[PDB]
Design a protein around this ligand. Structure first.
Ligand SMILES: Nc1ncnc2c1ncn2[C@@H]1O[C@H](COP(=O)(O)OP(=O)(O)OP(=O)(O)O)[C@@H](O)[C@H]1O
Ligand SMILES: Nc1ncnc2c1ncn2[C@@H]1O[C@H](COP(=O)(O)OP(=O)(O)OP(=O)(O)O)[C@@H](O)[C@H]1O
Ligand SMILES: [Cs+]
Ligand SMILES: [Cs+]
Ligand SMILES: [Cs+]
Ligand SMILES: [Cs+]
Ligand SMILES: [Mg+2]
Ligand SMILES: [Mg+2]
Ligand SMILES: [Mg+2]
Ligand SMILES: [Mg+2]
Lengths: 325, 325
């Protein structure tokens, strides 16, 4: 069976650089012939050799081709969008690939848009009976109304890689944290800070009915799991399988697969959890998790017997299983 | 008039013909110079005179240009996506227009995908405290588990114009109703049927400060408000305002504006309600309501003092005042 993959990375979101790092990880292990297309930070695309040059520079601030690119789509059998964050993970790029008729890796338009919004996903999961941290949404320009005591975490609703996230100890500091969050999104979420908190992560592989990886725990000495901790090698420790009680591992996997099914995710997702005072909370689902050298999604399925090339092979294959339907 | 609008109608959804009818209604009343582009049922586009020709035919089975079309997008200030249903109303075309950077009428990607999914939209509305009909989601290839007794209403999760919807009386008939619904979507909803029921519909207009139209009511002698009843002229009784006592009409508008904000809609929406034994239930929210001769949304706002050309003009202005934000 003929298979040629087009890999798209970069993007206009703050995670532009993280996306190129993920692209390098995928290219080093994907078992299919794969071409790279880069979306530069200005929204213009780089194709062919100019895309590989931008990958070597680990940043593409400016691109060549305005959207839509003159890409020979017919040459590829599956498109692998690796665009973390806004305009890549939130269903907008997915909508373009749907109208293009090309099979593509990962969640569709709906699952991507709803998993990217920290307020909407928490609305759906809370109704479904999934435990979530207390939270409220704040629209840019509206006065916040936080019906619980600090500490808070303030986040852009569409964020990734902990960009624009603040831990707020005093109400005096809510205004500055919201102003930081509103640089990246018109909507912010304010969550009750769990402290102390343990952070659990589990990978999911599959279309709607997912297969769960072992549960992993992230540990670090920074105040929280911030940008520098996430992508500086050595700062983040992954303990697989997570040191959890008899049965706690299964509950984490059951919640992840439940949220996966309810939201209708296809392909993959990394589901993050909080463990505080013995209580589990689902933090978020990431439909396009990182494949950077310090990323956890490949390591989680590595520990579950799915090697890195086999994981990428199954992702491309799941894209065709849905498209062939 | 310097403003130039691009109207997109047709589509690959079962509502292809309905979309063309809506295009004729909008083209007749829109006060800006408007070009039409038609998405044929095979996904290929028709531009210029061939799109006007398909409009007179009220059906476009085959197109000419494969997506993405060679449309001079820079000619148009606002794009009006008038595509009901799959690949038009569910966020796919919205994501494409987002990447084009074009201002467009109606809800964004997330709110479009959320409002089209009758399961996920009900979960969000229920979590916000909005009354909904008891329901359950049934996935294709998965046995149904319905915690309430028939009569049922079985629908494809992402449908419009009552396509694939069945009224069910006995559990022995559920599997055939689910089999019809699975011809249009991998997911279906089974709702508790309300009989007798009155059907109330309200239009909403705006981005941040949505304003409600007067409440209207649909009456019919057919079993339910099905496809033939919706679009055969004279078949449905459109009562504006609805013969209700004022307190019920004000409550309907209050709920519609609450659901509008809860679901994150901008531009427009028609909110459908059920009235059964004195209780109001929100049925669904349509981000691209029909503009056919038998359609409720334009009429509701003419009754509220907003003429047909003024309605479309404000839809276009709202698309511009959102973009500039
Ligand atoms: N409610 C909370 N209580 C305690 N810590 C939190 C809370 N919310 C966020 N954090 C800390 O901030 C980090 C980032 O939060 P979150 O996962 O929401 O951001 P993200 O950018 O979506 O992450 P990712 O890069 O995995 O997508 C978490 O790993 C956690 O360490
Ligand atoms: N729970 C219910 N109880 C009673 N009648 C129902 C119920 N669900 C659906 N119906 C009937 O079926 C019709 C279509 O249902 P629904 O509005 O969900 O379909 P739709 O295709 O989304 O409609 P639209 O064309 O407005 O998008 C309704 O107008 C109503 O008459
Ligand atoms: Cs996310
Ligand atoms: Cs809440
Ligand atoms: Cs809908
Ligand atoms: Cs339910
Ligand atoms: Mg995330
Ligand atoms: Mg996280
Ligand atoms: Mg509808
Ligand atoms: Mg309806």
């Amino acid at each position: 069976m003929e298979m040629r993959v087009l890999l798209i990375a970069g993007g206009v979101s703050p995670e532009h650089e993280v996306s190129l790092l993920s692209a390098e990880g995928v290219l080093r292990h994907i078992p299919f012939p794969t071409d790279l297309a880069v979306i530069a930070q200005d929204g213009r695309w780089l194709l062919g050799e100019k895309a590989l040059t931008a990958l070597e520079a680990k940043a593409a601030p400016e691109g060549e081709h305005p959207f839509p690119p003159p890409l020979s789509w017919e040459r590829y059998d599956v498109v692998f969008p690796l665009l973390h964050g806004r305009f890549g993970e939130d269903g907008t790029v997915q909508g373009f690939l749907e109208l293009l008729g090309k099979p593509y890796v990962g969640a569709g338009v709906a699952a991507s848009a709803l998993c990217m919004d920290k307020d909407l996903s928490k609305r759906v999961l809370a109704q479904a009976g999934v435990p979530v941290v207390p939270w409220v949404a704040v629209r840019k320009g509206e006065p916040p109304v936080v019906p619980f005591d600090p500490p808070f975490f303030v986040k852009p609703a569409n964020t990734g890689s902990s960009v624009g996230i603040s831990r707020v100890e005093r109400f005096q500091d809510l205004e500055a944290a919201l102003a930081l969050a509103f640089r990246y999104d018109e909507k912010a979420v304010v969550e009750k800070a769990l402290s102390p908190v343990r952070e659990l992560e589990v990978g999911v592989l599959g279309n709607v009915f997912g297969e769960a990886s072992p549960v992993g725990e992230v540990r670090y000495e920074a105040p929280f799991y911030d940008y520098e901790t996430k992508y500086t090698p050595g700062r983040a420790e992954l303990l697989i399988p997570a040191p959890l009680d008899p049965g706690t591992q299964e509950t984490v996997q059951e919640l992840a697969l439940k949220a996966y099914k309810v939201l209708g995710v296809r392909g993959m997702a990394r589901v993050d959890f909080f463990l505080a005072e013995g209580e589990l909370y689902l933090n978020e689902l990431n439909t396009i998790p990182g494949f950077t050298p310090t990323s956890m999604y490949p390591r989680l399925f590595e520990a579950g017997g799915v090697a890195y090339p086999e994981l990428l092979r199954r992702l491309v294959e799941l894209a065709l299983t849905h498209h062939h339907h």
